[PDB]
Paper text:
RNA polymerase (RNAP) is the central enzyme in transcription. In bacteria, the core enzyme (subunit composition α2ββ‘ω) catalyzes all templated RNA synthesis. Promoter-specific initiation is directed by a dissociable promoter-specificity subunit, the σ factor, which must bind to core, forming the holoenzyme (holo). Here, we present seven distinct intermediates showing the structural details of M. tuberculosis RNA polymerase initial transcribing complexes and promoter escape, using a de novo cryo-electron microscopy approach.
Our pathway concludes with a backtracked TEC, which appears to have fulfilled all steps of the promoter escape to-do list. Here, the cryo-EM map shows three nucleotides extruding into the secondary channel, alongside features consistent with complete TEC formation in this structure, such as the complete release of σ and RbpA, together with the rewinding of the upstream edge of the transcription bubble. Density for the RNA-DNA hybrid allows us to determine the register for the RNA sequence in the RNA-DNA hybrid within the RNAP cleft (+3 to +12 for this structure). This register is distinct from others in our data, as the RNAP has advanced further into the DNA fragment than in all other observed structures. As this is the only TEC we have been able to isolate in our dataset, we believe it is a 21mer, which, given the identifiable register and cryo-EM map density in the secondary channel, indicates backtracking. Lastly, our MtbGreA results indicate that the 21mer TEC is highly prone to backtracking upon incorporation of the 3ʹ-deoxy-UTP chain terminator. Due to the high CarD concentration in our cryoEM sample, we observe partial binding of CarD’s RID to the RNAP β protrusion, consistent with prior biochemical findings. Lastly, we characterized a backtracked de-novo TEC, concluding the productive transcription initiation pathway.
Author numbering:
A (entry chain A): 2 to 226
B (entry chain C): 26 to 51
C (entry chain D): 1227 to 1275
D (entry chain D): 437 to 1014, 1023 to 1090, 1097 to 1176
E (entry chain E): 28 to 109
F (entry chain C): 444 to 1129
G (entry chain B): 1 to 235
Write the structure that this text describes.
RNA sequence: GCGAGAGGGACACG
């Protein structure tokens, strides 16, 4: 009977991704645990993302703002890569204004206190001498994928453009087990998990949240007698 | 001569063709 | 098939349909004389013991 | 589950609108019926709740046009499913002929209690496993399930965990205490699911031989224990079968599964068969995913010896062309020679590909598991396409010589298009023709329905049932599932005037046929629908077993429509022959009693024959033994060929009352006139069955017998007597 | 042996068949009993006639025909053929 | 899509006035005559009851002045394959002798081998020494049409599945992004610029201004031209027609350059669909028998989503009692529905609508009506109008919803051309961003059609060692028995293109790469390539390119030399015991979406002639219960269900109402009566 | 975040040592993420004890049969292997079996020293005849999982002792499935259905409790990085 | 709330 409990060691490969190493897992409890954490990471790590935007010069998603090279739907698609981190659970609103020629990027937003944009270098659109963009985005906390909330579902005005929301800080999770499996039967697994997030939260926070979700979930099994 | 060359803004779509085409498509 | 010929010669013969076939009872909307439609079962009476 | 079908909520809400209206009006959710109507039309949230409440235990009929046969329409228990597609159980696909590449299906809702009872009892999918045509199962696993189960139950020698019997140094290290221990060892990377081990099973009936060897008479298996050399795949499979079924221990080819499900259908209640089929489906899918069967460029192996044999046969073709150019033969003969040598070459290439391919290859595994495809498609895929047909039907003698893996050239592809487009157009026209034939049969035989349990008529047709062999043996007649099976004996069977083997009125199933063959008797007099004496319809006993249910037919069965649909289903699937017609048109002209386009006159009297071999015409005369007259013949071109028997009709040969003098398709009218209704009935049944077996489609004869009975109801009148008759 | 059936397959049909002669008989048997049950429920408030509404423990909102078929399973009914 | 528009043109319909019809069409006129080579594609054709009758011109075919279909040919003289193109009809073609397109000329017009495959007079194919050859095909893919020329590895597919792929390439809906194919053909670009929708500069110049609506180019000499973009225009079949610029203010553009894209074009070239990661294993039976299982990413990231614009129409017309008017004032209806309507009827731009919502508030004179006698005398005293009207407004059909794009109003007051008797005519456009859902039809280019059985979450999808989930999983039993093994080769070459490659030219070059063109021994990731139709990547080249498949980011080859990969199960966690074939496949979104197919009826309009329910999805309509279905019911022996389906569900005009009331009240179903259609038959016989 | 619907846990007893646990309604797709983990922990995380090696008197090279017993060596090893034992000492304890004369021998003959116990004395092991004598020494130890027959690494440490496969785990068989309960109103919450079957040593409820304990330990190893985290809480 | 025309989907290769 191997009397050794497992541990957890972090290895910071880069800023946005890192490898955690849990060992020694019980023979056969390798791939299993890795997948049980992969699912949790890709599914239930709460985050923030833009829920609905409003542009003064348009009323729906299928038109064009004057001047801008892209069309409202292209701007929606480009504003689907905006990674944010809101603190206040309630909905918040942040504005954006640009006049004259130039490249409108994610760095030109004016988020209120608490919330912020973590990739100023993204290209949102391009304007010209006639360009004028005035867009207010709404950010709400949530988890997973929820499609756009309908205008008539709420009391939204005509100018509202609901946008489907994908709150998921994690970006890519994988794993691999290196089991010694020596002939002396003192065998064990060595789960090397690799987690990469989209700059919203470091992989430490995502894995901690997954562990919290799982510890709380399995309370029912332990909480029986 | 890989790629369809007689169009100005052609993306460089490299091709496996072994036989040259004497006649461009009409 | 051959609606004109059969219909007209039936008219001449003044022939009478008995309405007891399987396709004849489906046109007029009656229980087909087969399966659950035959009188052995259509008239079965059930009451609690 | 096999009795369930998904149903989108958007469809269930509209179908069940009045029901949900009543249910929610009862629940105060809407004050009056009009308010309920507005609520459901606007789809307020609680509606969904009530919808489920009503939809539970309420069958709905699913149908897919064309409704070729009875199983086209079946009753499923609905349930709400997200999305907008009717989720259909895979095992019913073969019944509907439904594939999921864009099909659509229609859903009807029975309303009255009679309609609901009919949907639940007569038409429920779990109650319809066997086909109504020949009794073979149609709810069995197919395609992915068959591949998964074949991978599961196959045994791979030299695999990890194998039972190695070496002793002296250490134990065998292959035995396991229970399937629990073996699955535990398989979850760890020690024991492969396809390794020869020895388990100690205690909840599975042993094979019959082991049953007699160990327990003897009445070993009650769920408690006892017995050792079994097997593979954990087979052990896991046998947990899917019912408790009492003996351990099978065989590689689960599709035919083996067919035998197993036939045994289950015959010997067990339909509910047990449905549950076993569902569990087989689940295991088959689960182990098809793990089977690792994939197709890739690397796994489509090419035969290494292609070049040498191709050069050999190209040299032979060059020689044939060379001697053609020298005038050695005409163009027809040289086309024949090229076609022959290239057919031989393609057959050889297929053989070489077959021998070169490994055993566990994905393509060879898929074809050899019975799941899909035939080896010809693999030969074309790797090997060579072979000969290709011209639009007229002749063979292009080139031929194509590049496999689809190697890639055809421009002209070879062009040649292939001929056959492809020809096949498609033929398919459409044949579909139309077979539809017409099905309509005609259904309209000529609908009024044949079972009416009496038994007419007690002593008459009955005869069945050959494994004729004698020249050396002297009982070689089983190949086509027995259609003729002898599922019929009731008209007279008892005896051997050498000994004890009775099978009494009159026996179902005559498979055990019964084995008893017959063991006793040595060959011929059996069995009742049929031809001899049934009932005034209206047919008596139940004469008809025999109902193929679907498996027991004797009911008193209300509409056997006529069942027979018509059975004969019309394999239509759209008969191919012609490359003159004696032998395709669907042959069936059409045979069931229409047409004068055959290729009549082969049969004699009308026995005795020696004066042959007069006619040139551009013919002439035959049979010396009558009544001596009445040697019925003379003429107008028969010098094309037909004397039929071959015992020997081919020879000068002075002793003919019979129906010896086909020449070759061709005899006429039912003349053979009726000359022999009688018995012989014309047997002739019609034999020809229709032969045509349907040219394509290898199995139909039980009793459907053809129903149709042929409906042919010969009427008699012509020669003398009116004195009663109103023309 | 019959594993626990569910939904529309319960009670097992093959056990019902022994309580009748043919499948068609079971159809009409159950349908007529279901009409009786629905009629009891529908007009229970007033002076119910010879309709003997449910005989086996009815479900909370068991559909009439289901109660009927279960009754037939428990040998709680009799029939006279046409 | 542009391909369908292009292919409808160039189509050759063998039926019409002065030509044979379908019933008159036999089973020999539909074949592929040997004279179709180079004049009519033998692959592309409808597969319904139109096979052979409807075809399409080959790529190089030109029509003679008299009407015959010519074909170019390279005349060979003295054994030298010159470049003197000459056009021949069928008569000249079969008069002379023609060699195959792919013959090994020795870089000077002389063949290598004596025996070359030659087409003789009467369509025969034989081998002839290189002395009698008189003509040569200009190039391979001279036989195929434009639609079929876009199928990569066509010479490995079968004629049936090639035909299906060619037919299905004309059915893809235009997506929102329209990524170009990783593996394609040289025909995409030409088939795109000739389709017409790709906006092209006629004369060179320098871009002056660019915006979503216009692209203003400055030419070399004085003249300026503002190309007007076509944004969100409804096509004839309901799809979108967006054009987006692909140039900036500083670019200079040569004459004939692709200035802007169309619906399905990506920087000039045709893009009918998207490249998704494909695995070729049978996954838990959800992808069973042509069913395909997608990943939720395709829904999350809008990989496969299309904008569909539906058009609704209503006209106010002069009625017998007066005129028809469209106003916000409407007979009794809760006021909330008027919230979306504007002051003058038609709804406001950008307003979401659903089934049963009002699009055009319309009323018509109710008819002659009777006042109560006291009301009537009081109204005669008033002189008041009846003010009756009956509300009949444009409401969307069931199962429709989405934003409102445009309201186009036509009135006689504006001096327009309207049909006589019509005062007002207003069009409303309603768009919906249809995602990909269960049952929507997806198909590659080689005839691998299939509906979407299930859309698994991203987490429970097979993922490579890198952790990238497979976007779609195709069954493996559908490949071998259809002889369409080009989907596998397309998969392999797609992986090679996505991951790039670099042939090790350290010791010369590998033998298999001897004939490989230069600047193919290396290729960066996402390096689009092209395999022409009948001259493209060989099997040996594919094996070689898979041998060198340079690692993505770390030291790791996800897909080994066999084209297969080690896949980790998404649910059980443990890897699949054997490697799986993974790659990138170009699959498309066919226009057979479920939202257009689902239908349900319980009560609707009825035919007045015979009282059967109406038919079709446009109206409510009920699914037909034909003769064959009734035969099946009779076979079962279900008399009562047949009576139900034929008597009180369809024609018992006195019975349908009773059935509705009985079900609503919960009573027993009433007994059926006699169908009205039988009474109609009786009256007609009389 | 508040789940808004707490999963429950109910059971339906099938036998004295067997159960069909139901967990419902788990989030989508929180049926497979924990079903497999619970299965693996049940199978190979609950400590137990069992035999590891055995030496039989009278047999040294002929590993097929044994004198004076109607059975053979394979039968004996099979019988001993399916024997339930509970122990507390970590080092390999040794046990003795000895029956002289004819008759039958069960699991009641093995004398357990202090600490080790047998929960099924009435289990037939073998039979003896013709004044036959059986004398067998067993080695029993505690551990986890399923250790195959350990190879005799020592050249001659145990000449008469042969190793054997060993079933340490208390739970013999676990299976699981999921469903799509309440697709519409509850948005397709999964229903995990575990079917667990265990040796007498413990009821399946106790096995699930221990599995939950070890699972919470292993998954809390991840939680002990950022305690002030955000995640799903049943509350 | 019918008719004609056109296009299109689904339909056994042993
Ligand atoms: Mg289909
Ligand atoms: Zn009879």
């Amino acid at each position: 009977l191997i009397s050794q409990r497992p541990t957890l060691s972090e290895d910071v490969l880069t800023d946005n991704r890192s490898q955690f190493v849990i060992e020694p897992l019980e023979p056969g409890f390798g791939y299993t645990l890795g997948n049980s954490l992969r699912r949790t990471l890709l599914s239930s790590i709460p985050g923030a993302a833009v829920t609905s935007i409003r542009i003064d010069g348009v009323l729906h998603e299928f038109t064009t703002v004057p001047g801008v090279k892209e069309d409202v739907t292209e701007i929606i698609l480009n504003l689907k890569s905006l990674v944010v981190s809101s603190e206040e659970d309630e909905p918040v609103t942040m504005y954006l204004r640009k006049q004259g020629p130039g490249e409108v990027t994610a760095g030109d937003i004016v988020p209120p206190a608490g919330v912020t944009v973590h990739n100023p270098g993204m290209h949102i659109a391009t304007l010209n001498d006639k360009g004028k963009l005035e867009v207010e985005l709404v950010v709400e906390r949530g988890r997973g994928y929820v499609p756009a909330v309908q205008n008539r579902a709420s009391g939204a005005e005509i100018g509202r453009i609901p946008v489907d929301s994908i709150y998921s800080p994690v970006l890519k999770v994988t794993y691999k087990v290196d089991a010694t499996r020596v002939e002396q039967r003192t065998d064990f697994d060595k789960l090397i998990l690799d987690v990469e997030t989209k700059n919203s939260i470091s992989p430490r926070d995502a894995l901690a949240s997954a562990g919290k979700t799982l510890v709380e979930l399995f309370g029912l099994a332990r909480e029986l007698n | 001569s890989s790629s369809n060359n007689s169009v100005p803004g052609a993306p460089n779509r490299v091709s496996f063709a072994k036989l040259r085409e004497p006649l461009e498509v009409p | 098939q051959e609606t004109t010929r059969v219909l007209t010669d039936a008219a001449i013969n003044c022939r009478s349909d008995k309405l007891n076939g399987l396709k004849e009872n489906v046109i007029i909307g009656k229980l087909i004389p087969a399966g659950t439609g035959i009188n052995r079962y259509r008239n079965i009476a059930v009451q609690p013991t | 589950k096999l009795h369930q079908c998904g149903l989108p909520k958007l469809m269930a809400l509209e179908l069940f609108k009045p029901f949900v209206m009543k249910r929610l009006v009862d629940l105060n959710h809407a004050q009056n019926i009009k308010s309920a109507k507005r609520m459901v039309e606007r789809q307020r949230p609680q509606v969904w709740d009530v919808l489920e409440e009503v939809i539970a235990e309420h069958p709905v009929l699913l149908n897919r046009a064309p409704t070729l046969h009875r199983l086209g329409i079946q009753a499923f228990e609905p349930m709400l499913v997200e999305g907008k597609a009717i989720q259909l159980h895979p095992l019913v696909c073969e019944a509907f002929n439904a594939d999921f590449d864009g099909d659509q299906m229609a859903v009807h809702l029975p309303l009255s209690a009679e309609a609901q009872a009919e949907a639940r009892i007569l038409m429920l999918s779990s109650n319809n496993i066997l086909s109504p045509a020949s009794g073979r199962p149609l709810a069995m696993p197919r395609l992915d399930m068959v591949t998964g189960l074949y991978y599961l139950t196959t045994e791979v020698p030299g695999d990890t965990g194998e039972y190695q019997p070496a002793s002296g140094d250490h134990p065998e290290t292959g035995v396991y205490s229970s399937p629990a221990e073996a699955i535990m060892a398989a979850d760890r990377g020690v024991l492969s699911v396809r390794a020869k081990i020895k388990v100690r099973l205690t909840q599975l009936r042993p094979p019959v031989e082991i049953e007699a060897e160990l327990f003897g008479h009445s070993g009650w298996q769920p408690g006892d224990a017995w050792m079994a050399e097997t593979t954990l795949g087979r052990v896991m499979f046998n947990e899917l079968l019912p408790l009492g079924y003996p351990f099978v221990n065989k590689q689960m080819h599709k035919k083996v599964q067919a035998a197993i499900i036939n045994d289950l259908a015959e010997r067990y209640p339909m509910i047990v068969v449905a549950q076993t089929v569902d569990k087989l489906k689940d295991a088959g899918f689960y182990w098809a995913t793990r089977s690792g069967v994939t197709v890739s460029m690397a796994d489509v192996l090419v035969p290494p010896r292609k070049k040498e044999i191709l050069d050999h046969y190209e040299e032979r073709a060059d020689k044939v062309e060379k001697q053609f150019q020298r005038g050695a033969l005409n163009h027809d003969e040289r086309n024949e020679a090229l076609v022959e040598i290239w057919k031989e070459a393609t057959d050889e290439v297929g053989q070489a590909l077959r021998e070169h391919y490994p055993d566990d290859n994905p393509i060879i595994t898929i074809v050899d598991s019975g799941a899909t495809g035939n080896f010809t498609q693999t030969r074309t895929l790797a090997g060579m396409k072979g000969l290709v047909t011209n639009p007229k039907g002749e063979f292009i003698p080139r031929p194509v010589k590049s496999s689809f893996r190697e890639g055809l050239t421009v002209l070879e592809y062009f040649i292939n298009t001929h056959g492809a487009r020809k096949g498609l157009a033929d398919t459409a026209l044949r579909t139309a023709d077979s539809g017409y034939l099905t309509r005609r049969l259904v309209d000529v035989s609908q009024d044949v329905i079972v009416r009496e349990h038994d007419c007690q008529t002593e008459r009955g047709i005869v069945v050959e049932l494994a004729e004698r062999a020249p050396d002297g043996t009982l070689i089983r007649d190949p086509y027995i599932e259609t003729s002898a099976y599922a019929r009731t004996l008209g007279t008892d069977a005896v051997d050498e005037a000994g004890n009775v083997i099978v009494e009159r009125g026996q179902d005559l199933g498979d055990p019964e046929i084995d008893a017959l063959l063991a006793a040595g008797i060959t011929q059996v007099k069995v009742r049929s629908v031809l001899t049934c004496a009932t005034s209206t319809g047919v008596c139940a006993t004469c008809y025999g077993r109902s193929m679907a249910t498996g027991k004797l037919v009911d008193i209300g069965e509409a056997v006529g429509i069942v027979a018509a649909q059975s004969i019309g289903e394999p239509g759209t699937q008969l191919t012609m022959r490359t003159d004696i017609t032998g395709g669907l048109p042959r069936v059409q002209e045979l069931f229409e009693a047409r004068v055959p386009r290729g009549k082969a006159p049969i004699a009308d009297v026995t005795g020696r024959v004066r042959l007069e071999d006619g040139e551009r015409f013919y002439k035959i005369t049979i010396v009558p033994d009544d001596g009445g007259e040697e019925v003379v013949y003429d107008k028969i071109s010098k094309r037909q060929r004397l039929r071959v028997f015992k020997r081919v009709l020879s000068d002075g040969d002793h003919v019979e009352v129906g010896q086909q003098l020449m070759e061709g398709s005899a006429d039912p009218h003349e053979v009726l006139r000359v022999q009688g209704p018995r012989e014309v009935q047997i002739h019609l049944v034999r020809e229709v069955q032969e045509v349907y077996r040219a394509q290898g489609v199995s139909i039980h004869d009793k459907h053809i017998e129903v149709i042929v009975r409906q042919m010969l109801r009427r008699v012509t009148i020669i003398d009116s007597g004195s009663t109103e008759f023309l | 042996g019959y594993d626990t059936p569910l939904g529309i397959t319960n009670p097992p049909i093959d056990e019902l068949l022994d309580r009748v002669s043919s499948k068609y008989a079971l159809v009409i048997y159950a349908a007529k009993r279901a009409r009786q049950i629905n009629d009891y429920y529908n007009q229970l408030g007033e002076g119910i006639l010879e309709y003997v509404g449910p005989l086996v423990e009815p479900g909370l909102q068991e559909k009439p025909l289901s109660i009927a078929l279960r009754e037939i399973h428990a040998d709680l009914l009799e029939h006279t053929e046409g | 899509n542009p391909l369908s528009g292009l292919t409808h043109k160039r189509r050759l319909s063998a039926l019409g006035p002065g030509g044979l019809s379908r019933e008159r069409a036999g089973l020999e006129v539909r074949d592929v005559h040997p004279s179709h080579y180079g004049r009519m594609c033998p692959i592309e054709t409808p597969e319904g009851p139109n096979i052979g009758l409807i075809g399409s011109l080959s790529v190089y075919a030109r029509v003679n002045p008299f009407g015959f279909i010519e074909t170019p040919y390279r005349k060979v003289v003295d054994g030298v394959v010159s470049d003197e193109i000459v056009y021949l009809t069928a008569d000249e073609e079969d008069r002379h002798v023609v060699a195959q397109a792919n013959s090994p000329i020795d870089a000077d017009g002389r063949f290598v081998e004596p025996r070359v495959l030659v087409r003789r007079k009467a369509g025969e194919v034989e081998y002839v020494p290189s002395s009698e050859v008189d003509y040569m095909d200009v190039s391979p893919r001279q036989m195929v049409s434009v639609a079929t020329a876009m199928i990569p590895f066509l010479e490995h597919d079968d004629a049936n599945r090639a035909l299906m792929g060619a037919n299905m390439q004309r059915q893809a809906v235009p997506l929102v992004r329209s990524e170009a194919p990783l593996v394609g053909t040289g025909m995409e670009l030409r088939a795109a610029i000739d389709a017409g929708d790709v906006v092209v500069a006629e004369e060179s110049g320098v871009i002056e201004e660019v915006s979503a609506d216009y692209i203003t180019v400055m030419h070399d000499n004085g003249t300026r031209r503002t190309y007007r973009m076509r944004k969100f225009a409804r096509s004839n079949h309901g799809t979108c027609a967006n054009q987006c610029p692909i140039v900036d203010a500083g670019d200079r553009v040569e004459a004939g350059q692709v200035i802007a894209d169309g619906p399905c074009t990506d920087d000039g070239e045709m893009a009918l669909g998207k490249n998704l990661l494909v695995a070729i294993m049978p996954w838990e039976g959800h992808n069973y028998e042509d069913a395909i299982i997608l990943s939720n990413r395709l829904v999350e990231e809008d990989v496969l989503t299309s904008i569909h614009i539906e058009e609704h129409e209503i006209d106010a017309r002069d009625t017998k009692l007066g005129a028809e008017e469209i106003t916000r004032d409407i007979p009794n209806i809760s006021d909330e529905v008027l919230a979306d309507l504007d002051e003058r009827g038609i709804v406001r731009i950008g307003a979401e609508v659903r089934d049963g919502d009002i699009l055009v508030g319309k009323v018509t004179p109710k008819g002659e009506t009777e006042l109560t006698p006291e009301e009537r005398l009081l109204r005669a005293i008033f002189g008041e109008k009846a003010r009756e009207v009956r509300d009949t407004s444009l409401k969307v059909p069931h199962g429709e919803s989405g934003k409102v794009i445009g309201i186009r109003v036509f009135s006689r007051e504006d001096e327009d051309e309207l049909p006589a008797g019509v005062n007002e005519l207003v069009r409303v456009y309603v768009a919906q961003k249809r995602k990909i859902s269960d049952g929507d039809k997806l198909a590659g280019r080689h005839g691998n059609k299939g509906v979407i059985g299930k859309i698994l979450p991203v987490e429970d999808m097979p993922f490579l060692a890198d952790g990238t989930p497979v976007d779609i999983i195709l069954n493996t039993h559908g490949v071998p028995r259809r002889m369409n093994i080009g989907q596998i080769l397309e998969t392999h070459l797609g992986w090679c293109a996505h991951s790039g490659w670099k042939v090790d030219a350290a010791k010369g070059v590998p033998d298999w790469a001897a004939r490989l063109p230069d600047e193919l021994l290396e290729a960066q990731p996402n390096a689009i390539v092209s395999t022409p139709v009948f001259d493209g990547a060989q099997e040996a080249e594919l094996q070689g390119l898979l041998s060198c498949t340079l690692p993505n980011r770390d030291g790791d080859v996800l897909v080994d030399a066999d084209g297969k990969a080690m896949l980790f199960d998404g649910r059980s966690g443990e890897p699949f015991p054997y490697p799986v074939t993974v790659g990138y496949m170009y699959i498309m979104k066919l226009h057979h979406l479920v939202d257009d197919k689902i239908h349900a009826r319980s009560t609707g309009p009825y035919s007045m002639i015979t009282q059967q329910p109406l038919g079709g999805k446009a109206q409510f309509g009920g699914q037909r219960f034909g003769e064959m279905e009734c035969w099946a019911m009779q076979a079962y022996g279900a008399a009562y269900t047949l009576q139900e389906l034929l008597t009180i569900k369809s024609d018992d005009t006195v019975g349908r109402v009773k059935v509705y009331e009985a079900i609503v009240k919960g009573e027993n179903i009433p007994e059926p009566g006699i169908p009205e259609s039988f009474k109609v038959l009786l009256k007609e016989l009389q």
